[PDB]
């Protein structure tokens, strides 16, 4: 019904207004502290070194930022190697798109447009195939019995695909307990902020991350699909009663 | 069948090996030219300004990088907040749509905790809204088709003129981006990839930011409904 579309739209709209209010309250006080610090650090540099013009500083800051955006760290004296470029391709296909590395060339951006257009539906067919095999394994008072088993599969999945890999990330990458879970959640939800990326020590570390992404993504999507299928059947019985 | 799962897996794996080979061939020669340029630009700066020690340069280069990671641009004297009433609302929508640009991200301890829970409950909320918009779009598509693969090309081409071509014109004139950069932003956005290399309302209208999220909402629910209508026929076929 169209009435439920406007209702769901309003709920989504107020959820963004609510979330936005909380995000501002947590991040904006810190954002102001970071804005004051860089402004002070630049004003001190120009005062200590009378040889460097404020525009000459801006020109070098821009060169450092340009090199950072491209992937080369200005600090110190490859992201496109056989394995890292393969992982980048997988990052595009999985709709994660971290953004730490991105196609800077003219031809790379054209190829990436076409690569995503044809590559994302190719991955969807693979996710469908893995979800069908996972659904058969998952299958192996009446409405609450089916929902009780759904809680069991969701909790167990959060110990194997969420808790277990976060332990590995905390010991390998040296990240905090929260940063290790935050990476797992943002990765599995295909959000891909890029603030934390696996492999920033071992050659088997990069292929084990994409395999975790492949199995972990196809497990939680299949649970949401098998639950959404039962919810569609329950919505038919709920529409006939009310 | 499980035979088709292993076959699709092998096709996906060779597609990443193929794509990875092309990406390296296009990006790695430029990556080497960017590495040599920053090294040269730093060696020239230290030679022209004998007052700045190479470590004093590295200290400031680190401060500039640190501010960029936090979200504040070191370039400029205005160091335009990313967490204002509208920009924070747009960030929330960026999380829900699984786009996650990454230009701005929750740096605080509490912000990361709230973001974990916000995505957990928020992504399935948007999925129900996408399902609702896809059902209304499917009824319009069914009536437009009546007036099977030939009609699918007609709906896909028309959608690329309104949701892809038309907004890219607006981005090229408002943001001042190139013709390719305007399409690349649209494609990366609507595919929920969200690289974050290009974002709406970058750095300098009140209606601009809410019109971007509405374009994301209608543009996402149109192409997903077209792919699901095809996927309905693929399940039967």
């Amino acid at each position, epitope marked *: 019904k169209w009435k439920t579309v406007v209702a769901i739209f309003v709920v989504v709209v107020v959820y963004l207004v609510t979330g936005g209010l909380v995000f501002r309250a947590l991040e904006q006080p810190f954002e102001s502290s970071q804005k004051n610090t860089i402004a002070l650090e630049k004003a001190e540099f120009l005062r200590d070194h009378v040889c460097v013009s404020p525009q000459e500083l801006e020109t070098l800051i821009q060169h450092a930022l340009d090199a950072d955006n491209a992937g080369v760290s200005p600090i110190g004296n490859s992201h496109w190697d056989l394995g890292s470029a393969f992982f980048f391709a997988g990052t595009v296909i999985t709709t994660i798109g971290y953004g730490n590395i991105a196609p800077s060339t003219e031809g790379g951006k054209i190829f990436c447009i076409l690569y995503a257009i044809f590559g994302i539906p190719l991955f969807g067919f693979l996710l469908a195939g893995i979800g069908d095999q996972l659904g058969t394994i998952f299958g192996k008072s009446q409405t609450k019995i089916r929902v009780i088993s759904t809680i069991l599969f969701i909790l167990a999945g959060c110990i194997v695909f969420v808790t277990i890999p976060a332990v590995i990330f905390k010991y390998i990458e040296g990240w905090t307990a929260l940063e290790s879970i935050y990476f797992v959640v943002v990765t599995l939800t295909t959000v891909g902020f890029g603030d934390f990326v696996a492999g920033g020590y071992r050659e088997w570390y990069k292929p084990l991350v994409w395999f975790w992404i492949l199995v972990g993504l196809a497990y939680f999507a299949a649970v949401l699909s098998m639950i959404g299928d039962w919810l569609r059947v329950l919505s038919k019985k709920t529409k006939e009663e009310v | 069948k499980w035979k088709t799962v292993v076959a699709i897996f092998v096709v996906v794996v060779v597609y990443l090996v193929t794509g990875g080979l092309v990406f390296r061939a296009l990006e790695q020669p430029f990556e080497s030219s960017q590495k040599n340029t920053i090294a040269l630009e*730093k060696a020239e700066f230290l030679r022209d300004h*004998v007052c*700045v020690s190479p470590q004093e340069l590295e200290t400031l280069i680190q401060h500039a990088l640190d501010a960029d990671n936090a979200g504040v641009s070191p370039i400029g004297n205005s160091s335009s907040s990313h967490w204002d009433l509208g920009s924070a609302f747009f960030f929330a929508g960026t999380v829900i749509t699984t786009i996650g640009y990454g230009n701005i991200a929750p740096s605080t301890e509490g912000g990361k905790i709230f973001c974990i829970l916000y995505a957990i409950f928020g992504i399935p909320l948007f999925g129900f809204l996408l399902a609702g918009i896809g059902d209304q779009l499917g009824t319009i598509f069914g009536k437009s088709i009546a007036r099977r693969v030939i009609s699918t090309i007609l709906f896909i081409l028309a959608g690329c003129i309104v949701f892809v071509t038309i907004p890219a014109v607006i981005f090229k004139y408002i943001e001042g981006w190139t013709a390719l950069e305007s399409i690349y932003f649209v494609v990366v956005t609507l595919t929920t990839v969200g690289f974050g290399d290009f974002v709406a309302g970058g750095n300098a209208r009140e209606w601009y930011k809410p019109l971007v999220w509405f374009w994301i909402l209608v543009g996402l629910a149109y192409f997903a409904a077209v792919l699901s209508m095809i996927g309905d026929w693929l399940r039967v076929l």
Partner: nanobody
Amino acid sequence: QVQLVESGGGLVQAGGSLRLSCAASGRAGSGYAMGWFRQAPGKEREIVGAISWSGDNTYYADSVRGRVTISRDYAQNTVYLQMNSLKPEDTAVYYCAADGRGNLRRGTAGRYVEYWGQGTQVTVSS
């Protein structure tokens, strides 16, 4: 490559002045930052000061901030050093350096400097 020739070392009274020179006879048409260094008998090599290729900006170490003055004749490609109010601590071999790759200021010793001078012995009597 560049070639450096010095002129100005010698015995000087305490409190007096030291006037050194260093001409760059090398036809290196890329541009190079020049500087002055001193190797103390018992200590390591220290930086005295630096000056850019055009001469628009100079630098002076904390050991000789208000006494020395690094001058430059761009027409004849020559750097000059005038150290007023001398002390017996200034007694050292004064070398002139010229690294056009940004490595002049790298350390306090100049262990990464491309072109080094001959060095002139300076001894402060009192």
